[PDB]
Structure formats: C-alpha cells, structure tokens
Amino acid sequence: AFTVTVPKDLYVVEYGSNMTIECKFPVEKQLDLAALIVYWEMEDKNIIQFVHGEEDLKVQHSSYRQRARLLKDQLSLGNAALQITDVKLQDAGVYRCMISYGGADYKRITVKVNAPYAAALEHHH
Amino acid sequence: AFTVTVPKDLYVVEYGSNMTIECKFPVEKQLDLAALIVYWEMEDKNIIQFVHGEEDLKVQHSSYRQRARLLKDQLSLGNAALQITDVKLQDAGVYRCMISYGGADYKRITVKVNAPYAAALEHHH
Ligand SMILES: Cc1c(OCc2nnc(SCc3cccc(CN[C@@H](CO)C(=O)O)c3)o2)cccc1-c1ccccc1
C-alpha cells in the first residue's frame, strides 16, 4: 500500500554546485507531521533525521555539517527533498531515503560527482 | 522519542551454528499488530518483512528461505529477534532492523562468522 518512489535513481552533479535529491511518498489528504519520519543517509552516515516536524542534526555525520537540509515545504506535497549545497567528491555514493508515514519504505539513489582536475587532485590527497 | 536499540551491535558466530540477533523497540501496553512493521535486511538483501501481523516472504532473498525466523513471541515483548539457523560465511556483514510503530528507527548489527578451513575453502570456490 505504502510505496516510496524516486523520479531519478541517478544524479550526475558538478563539484561545488548544489543538488536536490527527491523522494516521493503518498499523502492522501493533509500532512500528519506527528506521523512522518524521514531519514536521509548515504553509506551508513546519517544526513538528515526528520521527526515531529523538525530536523534533528544531533546525529548528522560531520561531513554533512552546515551543508544538508530537508526542504520542509515540499513535505506537504509528498516530496522528501534532500538539498546538499557545495557538492564535494565525498558526496558521491549510494544515498537512502527512509520514510515512515503510516506505512514504511525506502529507496536508493546513486550520486556521481564530476570534478575538474584540481578539485579531484586535492581529494586524492 | 521512539528509539530502536540493540543490546549487541556485533555478533561473532561459528560456521554452521544458530544465532539470534536482538532488536528492541518500546511497547506502551500491548503490541498493536496493525501498527507494527518489522524489516530485517543485510547488505540490500531482504531477510524478513513483518507487516499487518503476518510475515511477508514475497521479497525475501532466496538464501534466507526456511533458514530465517522472526520470533513472534518476543515481538509482543518489544524484541524483534531474528533467528538464523546453520550460519554460513555469506551471512557475515552488516544487518539492519527497521521498525515502524508509532514512530520509526533502525539499528545496524555487524555479524562476523568464524569458520574452519574446509568451510572457508568451499566459500572461496
Ligand atoms: C524505512 C523503514 C522501513 O522499511 C520497510 C520496508 N518495506 N519495504 C522495504 S525495502 C525497499 C527496497 C528494496 C530493495 C531495493 C530498494 C532500493 N530502491 C531501488 C529500487 O530497486 C532504487 O530505486 O534505486 C528498496 O522496506 C521499516 C521500518 C522503519 C523504517 C524507517 C526507519 C527510519 C526512519 C523512517 C522509516
């Protein structure tokens, strides 16, 4: 009954730009913030935890500090949108949006990051 | 808040033995089966899915059929206990118990499998 869907399972973004990863879940009538739980994570590193209508950055992995936010306006439309500003090469990998809202589901989203030689060279060292 | 806790985040088991990995969640009074969702997985392979008060093996990976059980007696005590009999080296890796019940959380559990040379040689192909 409850299915999470992702329009894009793959994103190809540029180094230093901003990215928005979308993750859709059904909302029948009006959004029950008390029943919504949203988890954004990549490779066992927690990015976002949204419970009771507020972000919890107490468990956010340090590499995503000051750069990751959940677009709360899109939530009432059934869209868990993760925005990452200043995309780094470390941001490449497999992301997971986990959503609980009556039912529970999750989806994987792969991010590849293109970079110029200088940025890639610094990441390599 | 609603938090899933695991007594042991690491299990060290012997090849061919049976293991039971525990995953605790709070129950206010008596377990409301209609509101409970239990998801067990290791490394993107589904082991157990408990929805609507019934096991769902429709997405269970073939390796875990007839070899994995959710102890339903422990569920009413707030313990989603996954029992895997005849542990193989392929069972080593990162497990996740995902639980939705008036809230949502999950925990990771690492299983290491000790095996004699013969079992390792067979796994080695
Ligand atoms: C999320 C969750 C639960 O979940 C239940 C469930 N039902 N079903 C599934 S498994 C989906 C699946 C399978 C295989 C491959 C994928 C990857 N998606 C691919 C598609 O192949 C892609 O689009 O790239 C995806 O879990 C259960 C309990 C709690 C929670 C929760 C915890 C914390 C926060 C919020 C909620």
Q: Tokens 């925005």, residue?
A: A83
CA separation for the pair B12, B89 (Å, rounded):
11
Both structure tokens of B45: 């392979």
Whether B55 is in the pocket of ligand 1, judged by its Cβ within 6 Å, is no
Both structure tokens of B41: 């997985």
Confirm if A34 and A50 have CB atoms less than 8 A apart: no
Burial label, B21 (beta-carbon count in 10 A; 0-12, 13-18, 19+): buried
CA separation for the pair B120, B27 (Å, rounded):
41
- The CA distances from residue B102 to A23, B17, B36, B74, B124, in Å, are 22, 35, 8, 18, 44
CA atoms within 13 A on the CB side of B50: 26
Residue B81: count of CB within 10 angstroms of its CB:
19
CA separation for the pair A66, B100 (Å, rounded):
29
Both structure tokens of B64: 């875990």
Q: For residue A80, how far is its CA from the centre of ligand 1 (angstroms)?
A: 14
Q: What is the CATH number of the domain that holds B12?
A: 2.60.40.10
Residues of chain A found within 8 Å of residue B100, distances taken between Cβ atoms: 37, 100, 103-104
Experimental technique used to determine this entry: X-ray
CA separation for the pair A91, A110 (Å, rounded):
10
CA separation for the pair B115, B91 (Å, rounded):
12
Domain count, chain A: 1
| Chain A residues 72-91 with a CB less than 8 Å from chain B | none
Whether A51 is in the pocket of ligand 1, judged by its Cβ within 6 Å, is no
Confirm if B106 and B97 have CB atoms less than 8 A apart: yes
Domain that holds residue A12: 1-125
User: Is the CB of residue A44 less than 8 Å away from at least one CB of chain B?
Assistant: yes
Give me the helices (H) in B26-116, please.
72-75
CA separation for the pair A46, A57 (Å, rounded):
9
Residue B14: count of CB within 10 angstroms of its CB:
13
Q: What single string gives the DSSP state of each residue in A66-103?
A: TTEEE-GGGGGGTB--EEESS--GGG-EEEEEEEEESE
Whether B56 is in the pocket of ligand 1, judged by its Cβ within 6 Å, is no
